[PDB]
Write a protein that binds this ligand. Structure first.
Ligand SMILES: CCCCCCCCCCCCCCCCCC(=O)OC[C@H](COP(=O)([O-])OCC(O)COP(=O)([O-])OC[C@@H](COC(=O)CCCCCCCCCCCCCCCCC)OC(=O)CCCCCCCCCCCCCCCCC)OC(=O)CCCCCCCCCCCCCCCCC
Ligand SMILES: CCCCCCCCCCCCCCCCCC(=O)OC[C@H](COP(=O)([O-])OCC(O)COP(=O)([O-])OC[C@@H](COC(=O)CCCCCCCCCCCCCCCCC)OC(=O)CCCCCCCCCCCCCCCCC)OC(=O)CCCCCCCCCCCCCCCCC
Ligand code: HEA
Ligand code: HEA
Ligand SMILES: CC(C)=CCC/C(C)=C/CC/C(C)=C\CC/C(C)=C/CC/C(C)=C/CC/C(C)=C/CC/C(C)=C/CC/C(C)=C/CC/C(C)=C/CC1=C(C)C(=O)c2ccccc2C1=O
Ligand SMILES: CC(C)=CCC/C(C)=C/CC/C(C)=C\CC/C(C)=C/CC/C(C)=C/CC/C(C)=C/CC/C(C)=C/CC/C(C)=C/CC/C(C)=C/CC1=C(C)C(=O)c2ccccc2C1=O
Ligand SMILES: CCCCCCCC/C=C\CCCCCCCC(=O)OC[C@H](COP(=O)(O)OCCN)OC(=O)CCCCCCCCCCCCCCC
Ligand code: HEC
Ligand code: HEC
Ligand SMILES: CCCCCCCCCCCCCCCC(=O)O
Ligand SMILES: CCCCCCCCCCCCCCCC(=O)O
Ligand code: FES
Ligand SMILES: [Cu+2]
Ligand SMILES: [Cu+2]
Lengths: 105, 139, 276, 223, 115, 53, 331, 165
């Protein structure tokens, strides 16, 4: 959940302009380098840190990596609410999740 | 040695005078009485010079004239065999490394580093002290 | 001619400041005379005796001149004794602390700003008596009723009358600060607990002749924003000061109480720091 | 005498206004607003000593506290009177509570700690390093109310866990797990700091190998 | 010192900060007084004192090397506060009374300074 | 001593915060301290015998 | 320092202002810190007093007088520590003020003995002599400013300002920097067997002198009007914005002045005119100019007979002892 | 010795950890000290990937080939040295390491490389205990990996010749 104060520094990757519901963004938690949980989230730098080899993704710039051997952004999930007020998924990831291989991401 | 003792006696006399004068001048005329922090330093620097001067005085009274203390002398007087002056040794740098390890372990509060530094200091000092006394190996 | 020999000392606004300036000028002239003499000696011995000329055997091996050394060791003792006597006189004068003052300010210095107190106003005229002490202290600090408190956006301005005995009581909340007004030609350190450390945090000013605005700095090491603790001093007429005080007694800021006596509300010698 | 925050707004004015403003407005150079925050934020920030802060950089470190004799209450009440932030828990005496918040359940508390908290601190609450300066401190010297207010107010670069996503039982159980994990023995000998194989490798190289090589030097001749 | 000067010209904070300036003058004073002058004294002593008194060596020849290495490593320890993210020591060269406490000046550069 | 310690020492897991055991936390250190020290003493005796007889 | 570390790592209540903790630290630190400046001052007095007679072709004026002046400065340096704490209002001012006035004298006799040793000789200005004369000038100005600083009613204004900075920079620079360069240019052959270049030495000296006197002279005026030390910023409405520019120009000149010295040392250590004799500066003393220019291990292959404090001079000029003993007391 | 240090020092306390679950993680994730070089090499290798037609070559491929190259260069050293020096005789007397300066320098360079790779694996512990930035340690390792081996080579060569003298 992003503070309402900023909400103007978001960059919104080319194919996922409507994947967020207000101030919720819901990125994946599997690091795009070798698959450890990227769970270290710094609340006022908006950086996600993978503790296995220390990559850093920019939560305000479609989870773009900004340090380390990580080279691909984290996948984003589309969300919304249902007719009762609960958070549901609005589809599927647009691309595979996790480490890469010969075929594709 | 007669002149070193006289130097230290002069210094001790002046330091004792200054210490007493400062103490009795701050007992009065001062805001809170005796100052208690310069007084102590002064009496104990007096004690330092007193210890050194007294040792030199005893050694001078227990000694016969020396070619250094003696004028009138020639280089054939000191002809002889001096002491033992250590040639090359590599233990000082290890002692310094150990002490620096202990110091940096005390700066950043890390007890394991302090313990390791103390152990290394003991080991290096033992190596320095025993360097010219180890005998040949027993096989 | 004397603005040069003062080496940039600002002229005083207090009698003791003027005594201090007189002593400073005298001592500067004396030291300059000594330096000129000795530099002349050096330039002479290096300009003429330099002549390792066409002819030379070896100059002369002389090394002892007992009477000359006795003379040149006896004269500096007198030269320093004169100025020691004079400085003792002046430094005794500048710290008199007469028992009965007429205005008593409580200066508190905290982390990177000031706060002034107005502890007591009692003119020798019988024209104005006031007491601002406060048991708001529910412990060495002093708390008052009329407190001008400075913030990072407004330079705290202290207002004082002209031609009255002033007394300053210096206390600090956290660390050592410095209380320097370059026009008083005087400064004193603001200690945390001045009584447990055997320092007297009280000094007086005989009178302030000129009126106007003057700047003050901190002269210690306070930490990050040491260079951003400036304040100001406004010296006004006694009746204008009385009007300021009685208009401040009715709840009003310093800016409006200053504007109500036809004076600029903000500090005119200092501006708040943008680069903070 | 709750109608007395004249103390409070006596200490703030002489220790905070240079970085937060006279009206708690957040001097646009250094400090935040401090309006929406409450008594819990002030309690955690001052009691641990991170408050009144010197120069201020990537992380204000923990230091010795300046204020007590019930003046942490004074500043807390004064700040709560200017907003609606969270408040500190109290016991039936009016003091700040303790051992009744020990989530009698340590399994659930430990699972919650490993899912939510262990990523930045540790398996057992040792420190952890963040990016570019900042780190996550050790959880050993913090008492119970400090743990609660820490995960309730969300201090610098630490996420904020509300009472809706982490209910009060969850918080009590996490507190109990932390306080038990920091005070249990090591039933295998001297633990080498709480971390993984780095102290173990160092201890091997600097104890076992030197013992073995020293005995090899003693037994065998040198030539 | 050159960094200090080039900041002190031209009013306004052009490229430094307040913290960095304080660290600069602290470390300048410390280095120039304790890591350059006091050891250069013993440098000249070790160079030309035994020659001047007509001796073959100093009294204790290994204590000499011990002194040199202690000096070098102490200096390196004290200087290595700049690689700390908080910086070096920021109080004065003189380290006045309550400013170097634990409440004020809480960084990890003062510890290295002291040791 | 190793044999006696292994036979008669309180070894079961007792950890809690009410009854601070501290006797269970010493059960493995004692095993190691007796076993290793016994066999080390035997080795040192053997080395001395080889070096001096 | 151990007390301070205990207070920082254990909360040891040693220096709290509640106790006498604020003035205790200052007393201890300054009792250390004044002997420190005299420690780094005295041996360089020795260096210059040892360089002067070699290039003046004369004996050192007042040997025993210089020894007594050194002893007096040493004895007095430990009982003046509190002239650094005038503005705290917690010390006995007349005691320390008078005793600093007292310590001002032996330095004067030392200065006069140096000037006397240079008097009516045969001067030649090679780089060591040039640096020694620079030392003389700079230290005189610094000591004048210091004795001006020693009176309490004046320190009540100029303390913690740039006047103090100018003062101790004069004394520190003039002593360590100039006497150290003199000692280097003097004893480089005796430790290497080569000779440093002289044109580069003169260029170095003049650059250093000009840059130094242009970077630190205006700071007296800059600090007399209110500008305290340890400020990172100031306002344009204040004065003193041109003096800071002059000072920074001087600082950059001083910074550029170091290239000739390191270039000279880098070139002259390997190349450079070799020395195949003892005493490359003729008319030397002190028994170090009586052994091969790079001394052997153990420093000596033979010693001369010692009768005075100029043994090498009497060794290289044996026809001079009668004239050195005859006219040694004219003055 | 093994019994003593297995009784007095604690190693791998699995109960302080938990069972493996793909959703939770901790901060110190190092292997034992003989795989730390593999981990450090994976940490300090820059993110260089190649994307061409319908395919992807990720970064850890680099770690794979470097690891394999090390494991291939270890067993094939004697043949390299005999090809380069051209000496094929029988030898039963050993050499003192100071008499062969080039091989000693090569070995010291390899040991320095290994030490850099091993220390680059405890980034978190070093940056936490000793107050250093994390990005700083990453870049220190990334640059040391290139400038420390040759410096060590130079110093070791000169040191060997000094011992000979
Ligand atoms: C954090 C630390 C971790 C600790 C790890 C565990 C600790 C165990 C100790 C290490 C190994 C133990 C050795 C077992 C042998 C003991 C039996 C014995 O007495 O043999 C005599 C043995 C003589 O051997 P030798 O074959 O006859 O050769 C004689 C020649 O003269 C040879 O003469 P040399 O000229 O070649 O030089 C002699 C050299 C020989 O000594 C050594 O080399 C031992 C160190 C080798 C370790 C490997 C180096 C790795 C560094 C890279 O010793 C030295 O140079 C001086 C160093 C001082 C050592 C003693 C100080 C103990 C500090 C305690 C704290 O001398 C020693 O080794 C004494 C060292 C140990 C002291 C006794 C044990 C006391 C332990 C603590 C007491 C509390
Ligand atoms: C605080 C700082 C403490 C400073 C250490 C004391 C420095 C003493 C220097 C004064 C005299 C210099 C001298 O005699 O040269 C010996 C020697 C210099 O050898 P050299 O230059 O080749 O000349 C050989 C001589 O011709 C002939 O030399 P030698 O072979 O005939 O030996 C003379 C004698 C040396 O005569 C003495 O000076 C005995 C003084 C008693 C030592 C007490 C110091 C304990 C410090 C308190 C801890 C706080 O050596 C001994 O008899 C054995 C001394 C054992 C030293 C014990 C140090 C243990 C420190 C570990 C502390 C851990 C516990 C605290 C936790 O230096 C030493 O052995 C002293 C060790 C210094 C290591 C620094 C520690 C860091
Ligand atoms: C290396 C040297 C050095 C030397 C030699 C000196 C020499 C002297 N110093 Fe200085 N001083 C410092 C380094 C030095 N100082 C430093 C580093 C500081 C402050 C640092 C800090 O605070 O951070 C300092 C600060 C300092 C202060 C306090 C500043 C303060 O207010 O904060 C004072 C005065 O009390 C002082 C006085 C003197 C005096 C009286 C001498 C006397 O020794 C000098 C006397 C010299 C003369 C050259 C006289 C020449 C003689 C003749 C020509 C006869 C002339 C006779 C008459 C005029 C009577 N020094
Ligand atoms: C022995 C001592 C000594 C020396 C030599 C110096 C040298 C210089 N000092 Fe320093 N100074 C002090 C001791 C010394 N100082 C002390 C004690 C203080 C106050 C301490 C404090 O307040 O805490 C102080 C404070 C101080 C200040 C003010 C700090 C403050 O604001 O209060 C200033 C500048 O105004 C200053 C300037 C200089 C300058 C311009 C030089 C010039 O002499 C130096 C010129 C030098 C060079 C430029 C080096 C050349 C460099 C290059 C060639 C760069 C090459 C780089 C690489 C190869 C790495 N000094
Ligand atoms: C390396 C980096 C740079 C750390 C150095 C600290 C830095 C801030 C200043 C250093 C000063 C330096 C530049 C000048 C020279 C200093 C001089 C040469 C001596 C200092 C050398 C130091 C102290 C040696 C150690 C450096 C460090 C890299 C060693 C790592 C050792 C590993 C991490 C041990 C791991 C370990 C840990 C982490 C434990 O918590 C622990 C707890 C209980 C028991 C054991 C351990 C244990 O082994
Ligand atoms: C000597 C040999 C390596 C040369 C091989 C020739 C080479 C051309 C073949 C190709 C190899 C390739 C190209 C590069 C090799 C680099 C690396 C990738 C190799 C992987 C495995 C490798 C072959 C293993 C060799 C490593 C080396 C031989 C270690 C020996 C170290 C020395 C001799 C120990 C002597 C005594 C010792 C110093 C006692 C004091 C204790 C000190 C502090 C040990 C230092 C230390 C170490 C060594 C740790 O591993 C460690 C791990 C975790 C925590 C701490 C430490 C630690 O402090
Ligand atoms: C600096 C050295 C200063 C003094 C040395 C003498 C020690 C005197 C020993 C007496 C201690 C005592 O009795 O104090 C009882 C207190 C109760 O405090 P607590 O909070 O209530 O308990 C909760 C505890 N955490 O424990 C303590 O402070 C612990 C004391 C720490 C031990 C002393 C440190 C020694 C390290 C040596 C440094 C070597 C570095 C060399 C590098 C150059
Ligand atoms: C300018 C120096 C400074 C001083 C003095 C200071 N603060 Fe702070 N304060 C900060 C900074 C900077 C932060 C930002 C939090 C952070 O980044 O760690 C902060 C944060 C806070 C917070 C938490 C803000 C939040 O959103 O959670 C509180 C509460 C607070 N301060 C209260 C105080 C109290 C109480 C005092 C003591 C009277 C005080 N401040 C004095 C600088 C200061
Ligand atoms: C890496 C993100 C992060 C997460 C996730 C996190 N912490 Fe923190 N924690 C921090 C940081 C950063 C600080 C330092 C804040 C400060 O110093 O102002 C901190 C401080 C604390 C402190 C204060 C420690 C002390 O000694 O004062 C406690 C207690 C704490 N956290 C508990 C928790 C608990 C419980 C959780 C799990 C609900 C948690 N933390 C999750 C990063 C994190
Ligand atoms: C080559 C050795 C370097 C020695 C130490 C250099 C110190 C550089 C300091 C600048 C790095 C960044 C400092 C903190 C961030 C800013 O802002
Ligand atoms: C061996 C070094 C090779 C470096 C190649 C760099 C490739 C950059 C890829 C982008 O995309
Ligand atoms: S797995 Fe997240 S960085 Fe390699
Ligand atoms: Cu200030
Ligand atoms: Cu002072």
């Amino acid at each position: 959940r992003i503070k309402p104060s900023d909400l103007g520094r978001v960059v919104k990757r080319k194919g996922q302009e409507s994947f967020n519901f207000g101030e919720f963004f819901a990125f994946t938690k599997v690091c795009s380098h070798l698959g450890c949980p990227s769970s270290l989230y710094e609340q006022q730098s908006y950086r996600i840190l993978c503790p296995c080899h220390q990559s850093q993704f920019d939560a305000l710039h479609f989870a773009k990596p900004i340090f380390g051997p990580a080279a691909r952004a984290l996948a984003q999930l589309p969300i919304t609410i249902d007719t009762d007020g609960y958070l549901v998924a609005n589809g599927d990831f647009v691309e595979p999740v996790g480490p890469a291989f010969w075929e594709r991401t | 040695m007669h002149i070193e003792a006289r130097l230290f006696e002069i210094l001790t006399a002046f330091f004792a005078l200054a210490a007493v004068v400062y103490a009795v001048l701050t007992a009065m005329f001062a805001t809170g009485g005796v100052e208690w922090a310069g007084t102590t330093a002064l009496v104990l620097t007096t004690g330092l010079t007193l210890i050194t001067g007294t040792f030199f005085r005893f050694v001078a009274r227990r000694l016969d004239t020396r070619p250094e203390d003696y004028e009138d002398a020639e280089i054939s007087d000191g002809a002889g065999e001096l002491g033992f002056f250590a040639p090359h040794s590599w233990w000082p740098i290890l002692i310094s490394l150990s002490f620096s390890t202990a110091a940096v372990g005390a700066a950043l509060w890390l007890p394991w580093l302090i313990a390791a530094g103390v152990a290394f200091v003991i080991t290096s000092v033992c190596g320095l002290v025993f360097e010219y006394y180890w005998g040949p190996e027993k096989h | 001619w004397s603005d040069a020999l003062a080496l940039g000392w600002p002229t005083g606004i207090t009698p003791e400041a003027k005594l201090n300036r007189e002593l400073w000028i005298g001592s500067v002239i004396a030291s300059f005379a000594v330096g000129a003499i000795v530099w002349g000696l050096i330039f002479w011995t290096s300009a003429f005796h330099r002549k390792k000329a066409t002819d030379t055997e070896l100059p002369r091996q002389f090394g002892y001149n007992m009477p000359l050394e006795l003379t040149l060791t006896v004269i500096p003792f007198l030269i320093i004794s004169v100025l020691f006597y004079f400085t003792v006189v002046v430094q005794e004068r500048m710290m008199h602390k007469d028992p009965n003052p007429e205005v008593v300010i409580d200066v508190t210095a905290f982390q990177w700003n000031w706060k002034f107190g107005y502890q007591k106003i009692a003119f020798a005229d019988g024209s104005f008596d006031y007491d601002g002490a406060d048991p708001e202290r529910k412990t060495y600090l002093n708390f008052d009723k009329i407190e001008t408190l400075g913030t990072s956006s407004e330079i705290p301005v202290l207002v004082l009358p002209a031609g009255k005995r002033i007394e300053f009581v210096l206390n600090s909340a956290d660390v050592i600060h410095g209380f320097w007004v370059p026009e008083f030609l005087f400064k004193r350190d603001v200690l945390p607990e001045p009584k447990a450390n055997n320092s007297d945090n009280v000094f007086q000013v005989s009178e302030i002749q000129q009126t106007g605005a003057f700047v003050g700095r901190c002269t210690e090491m306070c930490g990050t924003f040491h260079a951003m603790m400036n304040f100001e001093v406004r010296v006004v007429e006694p009746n204008d000061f009385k009007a300021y005080i009685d208009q401040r007694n009715a709840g009003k800021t310093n800016a409006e109480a200053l504007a109500a006596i036809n004076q600029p509300p903000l500090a005119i010698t200092t501006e708040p720091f943008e680069s903070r | 005498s709750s109608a007395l925050l004249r103390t409070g707004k006596q200490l703030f004015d002489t220790s905070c206004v240079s970085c937060h403003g006279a009206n708690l407005q957040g001097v646009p150079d250094h400090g935040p607003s401090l309006i929406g925050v409450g008594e819990a934020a002030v309690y955690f920030q001052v009691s641990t000593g991170r408050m009144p802060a010197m120069r201020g950089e990537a992380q204000a470190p923990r230091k010795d506290p300046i204020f007590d004799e019930a003046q942490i209450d004074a500043i807390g009440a004064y700040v709560q009177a200017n907003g609606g932030g969270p408040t500190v828990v109290r016991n039936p005496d009016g003091s700040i509570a303790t051992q009744s918040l020990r989530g009698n359940d340590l399994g659930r508390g430990g699972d919650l700690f490993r899912l939510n908290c262990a990523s930045c601190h540790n398996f057992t609450g040792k420190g952890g390093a963040l990016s570019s300066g900042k780190y996550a401190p050790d959880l050993a010297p913090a008492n119970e109310q400090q743990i609660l207010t820490a995960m309730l107010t969300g201090p610098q670069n630490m996420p904020k866990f509300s009472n809706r996503q982490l209910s009060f039982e969850a918080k009590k159980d996490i507190i109990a797990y932390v306080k038990v994990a920091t005070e249990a023995r090591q039933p295998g000998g001297y633990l080498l700091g709480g971390f993984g194989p780095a102290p173990e490798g160092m201890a091997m190289w600097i104890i076992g190998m030197v013992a073995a090589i020293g005995l090899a030097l003693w037994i065998g001749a040198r030539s | 010192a050159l960094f200090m000067r080039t900041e002190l010209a031209m009013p306004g904070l052009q490229f430094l900060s307040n913290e960095q300036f304080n660290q600069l003058f602290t470390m300048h004073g410390t280095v120039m007084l304790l890591f350059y002058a006091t050891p250069i004294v013993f440098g000249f002593a070790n160079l030309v004192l035994p020659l001047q008194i007509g001796a073959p060596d100093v009294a204790f020849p290994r204590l000499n090397a011990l002194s040199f290495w202690l000096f070098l490593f102490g200096a390196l320890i004290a200087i290595a506060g700049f690689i700390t993210p908080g910086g070096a020591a920021d109080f004065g060269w003189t380290a006045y009374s309550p400013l170097t406490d634990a409440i004020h000046s809480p960084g990890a550069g003062g510890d290295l300074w002291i040791m | 001593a190793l044999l006696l310690i292994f036979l008669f020492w309180p070894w079961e897991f007792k950890a809690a915060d009410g009854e601070s055991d501290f006797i269970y936390s010493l059960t493995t250190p004692l095993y190691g301290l007796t076993f290793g020290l016994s066999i080390l003493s035997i080795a040192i005796g053997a080395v001395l015998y080889q070096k001096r007889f | 320092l151990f007390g301070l570390a205990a207070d920082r790592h254990l909360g040891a209540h040693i220096y709290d202002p509640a106790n006498g903790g604020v003035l205790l630290w200052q007393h201890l630190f300054w009792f250390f810190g004044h002997p420190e400046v005299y420690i780094i001052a005295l041996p360089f007095f020795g260096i210059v007093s040892e360089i002067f007679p070699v290039f003046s072709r004369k004996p050192i004026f007042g040997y025993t007088t210089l020894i007594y002046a050194t002893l007096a400065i040493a004895a007095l340096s430990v009982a003046v520590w509190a002239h650094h704490m005038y503005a705290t209002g917690a010390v006995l001012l007349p005691f320390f003020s008078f005793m600093t006035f007292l310590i001002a004298v032996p330095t004067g006799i030392k200065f006069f003995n140096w000037i006397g040793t240079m008097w009516k000789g045969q001067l030649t200005f090679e780089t060591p002599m040039l640096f020694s004369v620079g030392f003389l000038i700079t230290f005189l100005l610094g000591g004048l400013s210091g004795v001006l600083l020693a009176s309490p009613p004046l320190d009540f204004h100029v303390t913690d300002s740039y006047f103090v900075i100018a003062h101790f920079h004069y004394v520190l620079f003039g002593t360590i920097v100039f006497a150290t360069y003199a000692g280097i240019y003097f004893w480089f052959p005796k430790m290497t067997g080569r000779l440093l270049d002289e044109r580069l030495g003169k260029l170095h000296f003049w650059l250093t002198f000009i840059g130094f006197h242009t970077t630190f002279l205006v700071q007296h005026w800059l600090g007399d009007e209110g500008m305290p030390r340890r400020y990172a910023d100031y306002l344009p409405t204040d004065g003193f914005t041109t003096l800071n520019v002059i000072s920074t120009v001087g600082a950059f000149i001083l910074g550029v002045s170091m290239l000739p010295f390191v270039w000279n040392v880098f070139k002259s250590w390997r190349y450079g005119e070799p020395v195949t004799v003892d005493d490359p500066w003729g008319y030397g003393n002190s028994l170090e100019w009586a052994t091969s220019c790079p001394p052997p291990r153990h420093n000596f292959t033979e010693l001369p007979r010692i009768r005075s404090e100029r043994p090498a001079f009497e060794l290289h000029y044996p026809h001079m002892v009668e004239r050195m003993r005859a006219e040694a007391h004219v003055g | 010795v093994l019994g003593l240090m297995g009784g007095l020092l604690q190693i791998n306390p699995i109960w302080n950890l938990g069972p493996y679950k793909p959703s939770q993680v901790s901060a110190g994730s190092q292997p034992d000290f003989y795989m730390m070089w593999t981990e450090g090499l994976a940490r300090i290798w820059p993110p260089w990937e190649f994307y061409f037609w319908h395919h992807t070559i990720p970064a850890p491929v680099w770690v794979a080939v470097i690891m394999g190259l090390v494991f291939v260069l270890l067993p094939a050293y004697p043949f390299l040295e005999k090809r380069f020096t051209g000496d094929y005789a029988h030898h039963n007397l050993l050499q003192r390491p100071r008499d062969v300066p080039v091989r000693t320098a090569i070995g010291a360079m390899a040991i320095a490389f290994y030490m850099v790779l091993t220390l680059a694996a405890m980034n978190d512990i070093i940056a936490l205990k000793f107050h250093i930035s994390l990005n700083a340690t990453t870049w220190i390792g990334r640059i040391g990996m290139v400038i420390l081996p040759p410096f060590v080579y130079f110093i070791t060569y000169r040191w060997c010749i000094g011992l000979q003298r």
